[PDB]
Amino acid sequence: GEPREEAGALGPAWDESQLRSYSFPTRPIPRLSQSDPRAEELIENEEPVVLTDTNLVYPALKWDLEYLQENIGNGDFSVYSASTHKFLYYDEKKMANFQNFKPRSNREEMKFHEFVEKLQDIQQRGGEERLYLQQTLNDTVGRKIVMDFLGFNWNWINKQQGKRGWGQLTSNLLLIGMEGNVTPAHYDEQQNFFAQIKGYKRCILFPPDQFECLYPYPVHHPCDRQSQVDFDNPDYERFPNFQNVVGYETVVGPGDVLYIPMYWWHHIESLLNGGITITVNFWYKGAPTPKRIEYPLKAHQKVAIMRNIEKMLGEALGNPQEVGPLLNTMIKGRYN
Amino acid sequence: GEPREEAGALGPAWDESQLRSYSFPTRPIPRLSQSDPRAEELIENEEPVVLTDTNLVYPALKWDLEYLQENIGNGDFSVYSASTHKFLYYDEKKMANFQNFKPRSNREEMKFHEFVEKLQDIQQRGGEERLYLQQTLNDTVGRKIVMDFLGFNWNWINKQQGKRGWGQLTSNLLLIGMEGNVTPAHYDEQQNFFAQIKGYKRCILFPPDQFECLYPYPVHHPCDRQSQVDFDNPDYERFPNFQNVVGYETVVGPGDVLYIPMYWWHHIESLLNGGITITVNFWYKGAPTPKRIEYPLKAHQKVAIMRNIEKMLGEALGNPQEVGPLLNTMIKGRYN
Ligand SMILES: O=C(O)CNC(=O)c1c(=O)cc(CCc2ccccc2)n2[nH]cnc12
Ligand SMILES: O=C(O)CNC(=O)c1c(=O)cc(CCc2ccccc2)n2[nH]cnc12
Ligand SMILES: [Mn+2]
Ligand SMILES: [Mn+2]
Secondary structure (H helix, E strand, O other), X not given: OXXXXXXXXXXXXXXXXXXXXXXXXXXXXXXXXXXXXXXXXXXXXXXOEEEOOOOOOHXXXXXXXXXXXXXXXXXXXXXXXXXXXXXOOOOHHHHHHOOOOOOOOEEEEEOHHHHHHHHHHHHHHOOOOEEEEEEEOOOOOOHHHHHHXXXXXXXXXXXXXXXXXXXXXXEEEEEEEOOOOEEEEEOOOOEEEEEEEXXXXXXXXXXXXXXXXXXXXXXXXOOOOEEOOOOOOOOOOOOHHHHHOOEEEEEEOOOOEEEEOOOOEEEEEEOOOOOOEEEEEEEEOOOOOOOOOOOOOOHHHHHHHHHHHHHHHHHHXXXXXXXXXXXXXXXXXXXX | OOOOEOOOOOOEOOOHHHOOOOOOOEEEOOEEOXXXXXXXXXXXXXXXXXXXXXXXXXXXXXXXXXXXXXXOOOOOEEEEEEOOOEOOOOOHHHHHHOOOOOOOOEEEEEOHHHHHHHHHHHHHHOOOOEEEEEEEOOOOOOHHHHHHHHOOOHHHHHHHHHHHOOOOEEEEEEEEEOOOOEEEEEOOXXXXXXXXXXXXXXXXXXXHHHHHHHOEOOOOOOOOOEEOOOOOOOOOOOOHHHHHOOEEEEEEOOOOEEEEOOOOEEEEEEOOOOOOEEEEEEEEXXXXXXXXXXXXXXXXXXXXXXXXXXXXXXXXXXXXXXHHHHHHHHHOOOOO
């Protein structure tokens, strides 16, 4: 809501002009201490919460481009490129299903200084071209970064994994972005802790029961799990229920950790004119489904049922492009 | 097409005024000898054919109400009743899913003479109330009927079952109806030989790829497999593709045998002012599906896929009434 004040009378951390304007209402995600019972209650009920004092990535709070470039080593890093502010990721494996899909984002491997220089050059000419670096925190990075990575609050996050009954830590991703970068609305099938390090990022989350308002791509499409709605220019004729969507909103800064529950939609943007952003994400496999299914189902279980129906139909028909026509055949004049 | 002539200059077997008028075009089903290779080719390709000389139910050609009443015995027979000419059958087991479904047909058990008398009484007062008797040909009927039943051309129909690779003979049903009786359009999941004995019945068949034009009820509805379209007063707003339906038509009389392939729609009506009708149906389980599935699929395989999706969805959601809403959720703004 109202912008927080940096310690030491350093002024507001951000102002309203750094947030993009959208067509839907939002309400705040709770900001709570990790020792607060309400925070544990929210995570257990699969609702989002911002924890302000986990110290989850404390040793990484000194990370910037200068520190990382000298200590991360001389390895190759995956840099994603976009022509606009919207980063449009896609699944290359599913490109065969949609021969007319034209990719808008592009990946490239380079050294860290190549990433820094291409970053600085774009800011110099102001070319509106934006970049996103993604890298796994393992032993392939330099020694000093490994020391920092080992210094994460593994005690806290291991206990969270234990208490919630989650599966194994799937991925631990370092994310470095440019001001204005937007990852459009999408949902994931894993639990996530979103650990902010440098700069500020506005996170807008939508519950799984907003499926009907957000219109995800077909499961076999390369943009599977992403919303088809252009938040900047929504097509109300194709997507009429986008007029009904309501989100949960928060701005996370250094030291904050946001819990993004599995199947929850999230739209993440780096604040305009806010400098670079650095985030470390942790993803965990969800807990195994309880063997005594309790009716009526939760929204996220209906999402999984719909995903499976689309998958099985694509295999049974021998061609995922026939999924749509058959589903319409099933419905028209029978269920609508 | 043109009405056939009875042997012995006995005049046309029927005239056009005995056929009900419908809104769709039709073309004739081939009438062929059972020794004709074309007939074997049609049955093997799952296309309908009228065989004129099988002698399948030859000993039953002397069956009428007087002969049957004296020789079928003093057992109970299932008599279905309808207020109009349309016999609206339903699955009582599925009535729990649709508490607002009101049955229009009614079943009652009675002696054969009770059936004859209630038949004659309705014709006397001309009450437009119509009846349909259904009974399995087994050893529970009288001795003389068993002799006749044993006299069917079991050699011919056993060889057909063998050649097509069909499963076991599921049911062998005696059907006695009144003039004007209509069994509305529906499809079955078994192979059928329709053996006409007394009177004439107009059979209108639609291929399985007419699913989209005939709008079957939801699988969990008591009228599962039946068309929702009132052929007498079609609702083109609810059922727009009924304007595109095209049928295969024939009038079968004594001695004729119609092959109704599995998943083919059929609408059967006893000719107006044509007297009672008598039919014996034979149903067989279809051949096991070939283990090497050949793409793209046949229409009837897509029907089975759609049926299974509706079934599994009803079980997964714990309530078949939620099938419709979820299917719409899956489709709207995504596949339509
Ligand atoms: O913070 C922001 O701006 C928003 N970014 C994201 O949500 C985000 C992301 O950045 C990176 C990955 C890749 C995760 C992965 C998958 C397979 C193997 C390794 C790693 N995913 N996956 C789902 N969401 C993301
Ligand atoms: O000739 C006409 O007027 C049209 N009639 C029919 O299509 C017709 C019929 O009459 C009777 C039965 C019941 C079959 C059955 C099912 C389970 C156990 C025993 C028997 N079916 N089933 C599917 N279609 C029929
Ligand atoms: Mn994500
Ligand atoms: Mn039938």
